Design an enzyme around this catalytic site. Sequence first.
Site, mmCIF file in Angstrom:
data_model
loop_
_atom_site.group_PDB
_atom_site.id
_atom_site.type_symbol
_atom_site.label_atom_id
_atom_site.label_comp_id
_atom_site.label_asym_id
_atom_site.label_seq_id
_atom_site.Cartn_x
_atom_site.Cartn_y
_atom_site.Cartn_z
ATOM 1 N N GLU D 3 26.492 26.425 1.199
ATOM 2 C CA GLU D 3 27.873 26.149 1.604
ATOM 3 C C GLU D 3 28.873 26.737 0.605
ATOM 4 O O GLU D 3 29.630 26.021 -0.055
ATOM 5 C CB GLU D 3 28.106 24.647 1.789
ATOM 6 C CG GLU D 3 27.415 24.040 2.991
ATOM 7 C CD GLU D 3 27.888 22.630 3.269
ATOM 8 O OE1 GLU D 3 28.828 22.462 4.072
ATOM 9 O OE2 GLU D 3 27.328 21.689 2.668
ATOM 10 N N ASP D 4 28.862 28.068 0.510
ATOM 11 C CA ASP D 4 29.809 28.815 -0.316
ATOM 12 C C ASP D 4 29.782 28.368 -1.777
ATOM 13 O O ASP D 4 30.800 28.420 -2.472
ATOM 14 C CB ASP D 4 31.232 28.714 0.244
ATOM 15 C CG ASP D 4 31.334 29.222 1.669
ATOM 16 O OD1 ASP D 4 30.702 30.253 1.981
ATOM 17 O OD2 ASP D 4 32.045 28.590 2.478
ATOM 18 N N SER D 5 28.623 27.920 -2.251
ATOM 19 C CA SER D 5 28.473 27.514 -3.639
ATOM 20 C C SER D 5 27.937 28.673 -4.472
ATOM 21 O O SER D 5 27.187 29.522 -3.979
ATOM 22 C CB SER D 5 27.541 26.308 -3.759
ATOM 23 O OG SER D 5 28.023 25.212 -3.003
#
EC number: 2.7.7.6
Lengths: 45, 83, 262, 49, 65, 112, 56
Positions: D3-5
């Site tokens: 998640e866009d980490s």
Amino acid sequence: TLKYICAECSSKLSLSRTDAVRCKDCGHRILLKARTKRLVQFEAR
Amino acid sequence: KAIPKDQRATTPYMTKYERARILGTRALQISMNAPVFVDLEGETDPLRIAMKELAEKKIPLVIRRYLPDGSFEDWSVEELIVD
Amino acid sequence: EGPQVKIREASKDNVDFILSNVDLAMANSLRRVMIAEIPTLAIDSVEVETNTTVLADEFIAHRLGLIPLQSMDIEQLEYSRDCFCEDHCDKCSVVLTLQAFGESESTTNVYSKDLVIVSNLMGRNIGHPIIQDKEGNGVLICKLRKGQELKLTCVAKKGIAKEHAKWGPAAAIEFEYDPWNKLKHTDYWYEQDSAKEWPQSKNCEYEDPPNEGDPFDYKAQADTFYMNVESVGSIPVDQVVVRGIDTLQKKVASILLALTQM
Amino acid sequence: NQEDSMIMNQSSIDRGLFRSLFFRSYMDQEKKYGMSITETFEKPQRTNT
Amino acid sequence: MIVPVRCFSCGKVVGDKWESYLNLLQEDELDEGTALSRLGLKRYCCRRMILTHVDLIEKFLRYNP
Amino acid sequence: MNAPDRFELFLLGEGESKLKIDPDTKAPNAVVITFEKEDHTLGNLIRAELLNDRKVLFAAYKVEHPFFARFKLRIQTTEGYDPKDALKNACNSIINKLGALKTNFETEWNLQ
Amino acid sequence: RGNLMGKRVDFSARTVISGDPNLELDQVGVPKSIAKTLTYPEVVTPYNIDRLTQLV
Ligand SMILES: [Zn+2]
Ligand SMILES: [Zn+2]
Ligand SMILES: [Zn+2]
């Protein structure tokens, strides 16, 4: 009295209280406070 | 106006809200030094003791279920079938 | 019996060798210890007296923190917490200082060699700025013009790379094993063919292809490692490898001593 | 990383990666209402203030 | 600014390669890749440092203190 | 802000020890040893030597959380044998192999 | 709308959320500063008199 520094010519004024805010020899009212004379400890991290 | 025991026509099963408020009020009383009716197995938390009393139906409470017409019923938590 | 080391390249900075007959755990443990669990000397505290530079103070302290130092006889220099004195003493740290002032109209450059040693070493060989430039000039710390002074005192303390990345003597460690893919550890991705896209590595010269049409491999283990150690400038490569092996040996011996007392 | 980490290298951070400086300016000014009341920049004493 | 010390990955010292780098560029008129090949850099992790550096201290020194 | 100190990654805290031997009841003759202030560097190197032995039936390790320097080492040997002895033989084997690696490395370094 | 149906309340914390696969499904990782800032009033009982005494 406390040591002050002029804006443009960077001369040592050291004017006291009740002397307004104005440089001697030039009319630049911007007066610096100068840095403290004591050591400051830092960490390289 | 208090429906008698032979005319109680509500669900005999204890709902999740009734179990929730019974465990919450009972655990709140246990936290306030209430006489415990079950022997403890070494518990310290009041909610675990309240669930321990509910598992054996030793909670001395009775529910006053309000009916929409203004009447009510008295279903004791001991006779209520849990789960 | 045990491992065997065959050095291929030996220089002042890069040294490539072959460490074989070692289960993958001891090779990976070796490179992890060499990267991390090795002591080093770096600047920990920066005391700035006067600073007229256009750079920030803690910025200059960071740049000074990244400067490497010599760290040979660091074994007999105790830690700061281990010594029972207050603050520091000639047993824990090395005191350095820097004074720079612009002279002529051309800008003056502050080098790492401008640091002088004003603390006693008691026969040690640490505190000397490592000079690896071909012109004989140290690391360019900052530039100064006429009318700007810079006086500071640094306290070089001992530490490993786990506390900060400035205590990192080793550099890029080239780890490789199994040149010709026979252990079946990697399935190469190919658009048309894997032999025409993926080039051959250097270490392939030290072995041979497994030859097509041969039975499948499943009983062969991972061995014959290619390890290239690179030192920045603090300690030579032999002290990196030897101090790393002695570090892992002191850790395993510390675990054995921790189990004996039980 | 999900998640866009993003996972960032710590050794790169310690060497000064994406480190920035923040400068906050606090501007103060003394004023005079009707000349009778005059604000003055001074060190306040813990006895009479 | 003003020549980043060490590198942001490998960790090799590069600060002592700037003066030579420019010296190789302004004297020998070589390309950037050739000069980086003469300094000893063999990995692009270092190459991005010298290649993508924007020295702004020169524009900072032109102000009177 | 709130991140722990860096030197806490390898320094042992107060009131703690290096190894925590805790018996396990999941299988007969099984023990869980807790390692403090260490990571995969020691866990995998010990686990490999535990797997090279024939008296060990099960042997594994894991890091519960990356924010805490600790890892669990679950060992299960055969009946009539203690896992502590297998760990001692593992440590002795590692020390011997590292010593031979240092002696051979210096001997090969004196020829350059 | 701003004083009866809704309102700004105490005993709350607002910050950026992020993932962590090592945690459970129902848990949530709370920072230490938030844990030290917010509080909870517990009732002193003979079951936790020693624990609350330690906290004091
Ligand atoms: Zn003036
Ligand atoms: Zn001391
Ligand atoms: Zn690099």
